[PDB]
Amino acid sequence: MDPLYGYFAAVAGQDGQIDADELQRCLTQSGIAGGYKPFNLETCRLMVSMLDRDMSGTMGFNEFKELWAVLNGWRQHFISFDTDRSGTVDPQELQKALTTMGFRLSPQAVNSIAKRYSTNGKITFDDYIACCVKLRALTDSFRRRDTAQQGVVNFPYDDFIQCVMSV
Amino acid sequence: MDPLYGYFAAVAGQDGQIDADELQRCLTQSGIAGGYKPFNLETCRLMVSMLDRDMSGTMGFNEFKELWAVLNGWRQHFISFDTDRSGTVDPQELQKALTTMGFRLSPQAVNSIAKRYSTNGKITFDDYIACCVKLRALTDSFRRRDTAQQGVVNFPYDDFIQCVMSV
Ligand SMILES: COc1cccc2c1C(=O)c1c(O)c3c(c(O)c1C2=O)C[C@@](O)(C(=O)CO)C[C@@H]3O[C@H]1C[C@H](N)[C@H](O)[C@H](C)O1
Ligand SMILES: [Mg+2]
Ligand SMILES: [Mg+2]
Ligand SMILES: [Mg+2]
Ligand SMILES: [Mg+2]
Ligand SMILES: [Mg+2]
């Protein structure tokens, strides 16, 4: 028996599967939230999107074990940039946190990411994770259309929507 | 002159310019929502960044006027398929609604949208807008970069991300 099984277990027992609504309950039950403002649902939608890989709208347990790790990894990397444990982070001190944990972008590119997600000036922990989660799946999408291994991908119109809207 | 000024006037004189928290209000104040539930703020950042080239987190009244009209039209098509007055519409009903209002999307593409934005087999009115919103701002970005005029645009990894994280 894995410890993370139980949180996942009690929510949606038979399918062996959880959607965003099911996912949200069991994350914050297990305290990956970890003191901070517990994950709201439209964040959890992306997490599901990221990891289903079949358009199921759901992810099973070993897909769930995988997630908990990524969010722990990212949770601590947040706590570095807000050791006061307020909830928040200013956009510029966020700017570095973005660059650090990998696969990063230029000072001109990074701003775009902190411009959009800046909620009343500050950035929330929920906004932070939700940004990471959105990008990971965008990298992982870009990856799989970049069969050439270049870092430059041709996008048709219908393909570009079909891609971007799924995440 | 214009009846839409009062609703807008009430919400902000930041300059003569509103944010999402304000926009949310004046929409529901104007009752474009129209029986259905107020457009929630998760949607109403899209509505800013859709018509915000200058990354301010703001739109103005003349931009607003565009928005309200697009919605008044979009809303109408929804209410074709929702003679219920329910706030819910099936993902076939959605697929056809996307066609009739002028989107060049394939069988495979709208499937991949409809799948995503559905949650228990039907789509909320709020969701249908945020789907429709997202389309029209991503296609405006694709046509912004398609001065190739081909139906194909080519994307660096640092450009592809900074495109999709703005919306
Ligand atoms: C999210 O991860 C990825 C997933 C799939 C493909 C990619 C990447 C990726 O991160 C990536 C890069 O970070 C870089 C490049 C790249 O092609 C990719 C991917 O293709 C080259 C680069 O010049 C580009 O601007 C083009 O994207 C800059 C950068 O170079 C970095 C990493 C290079 N491998 C090399 O070590 C160079 C010296 O620094
Ligand atoms: Mg799955
Ligand atoms: Mg701080
Ligand atoms: Mg305000
Ligand atoms: Mg503007
Ligand atoms: Mg119906």
Residue numbers in the entry:
A (entry chain B), B (entry chain A): 32 to 198
Quote the authors verbatim.
Sorcin is one of the most highly expressed calcium-binding proteins in many tissues, and part of the 5% most expressed proteins of the human proteome (PaxDb). Importantly, Sorcin is overexpressed in many human tumors and MDR cancers. Upon calcium binding Sorcin undergoes a large conformational change that exposes three pockets, hydrophobic surfaces involving the EF loop and EF5 hand (Pocket 1), EF2-EF3 (Pocket 2) and region EF1-EF3 (Pocket 3). This allows Sorcin to bind and regulate target proteins in a calcium-dependent fashion.
Here we demonstrate that Sorcin binds doxorubicin directly and with high affinity and that it changes its cellular localization upon doxorubicin treatment and limits the toxic effects of doxorubicin in the cell; the low resolution structure of Sorcin in complex with doxorubicin allowed the identification of at least one chemotherapeutic drug binding site. The asymmetric unit contains two dimers (A–B and C–D). The structure contains 10 Mg2+ ions (3 bound to monomer A, 2 to monomer B, 3 to monomer C, 2 to monomer D). Doxorubicin is bound to the B monomer. The superimposition between the Cα trace of doxo-SCBD with the Cα trace of apo-Sorcin yields an rmsd of 1.11 Å, indicating that the structures are similar and therefore neither Mg2+ ions binding nor doxorubicin binding are able to promote the conformational changes induced by calcium ions in Sorcin. Inspection of the Fo-Fc electronic density map allowed the identification of two peaks: one close to the EF5 hand, which does not bind calcium in Sorcin and is responsible for dimer formation, and the other close to the D-helix connecting the EF2 and EF3 sites at the interface between the two dimers. We succeeded in modeling the doxorubicin molecule in the first site (close to the EF5) whereas it was not possible to model the doxorubicin molecule in the second site (close to the D helix) indicating both the low occupancy of the site and the flexibility of the doxorubicin molecule. The binding of doxorubicin to SCBD in pocket 1 involves a stacking interaction of the drug with the aryl ring of Tyr188 of one monomer and interaction with Asp177, Gly182, Phe173 and Phe134 of the two-fold symmetry related monomer at the dimeric interface. In the second putative site (pocket 2) doxorubicin likely interacts with Trp105 and Phe134. In the structure, magnesium is bound to EF3 and to part of EF1 and EF2 sites, showing that in Sorcin the first three EF-hands can bind not only calcium, but also magnesium, with rather high affinity, and that EF3 is the site endowed with the highest affinity for divalent cations, responsible for Sorcin cation-dependent activation.
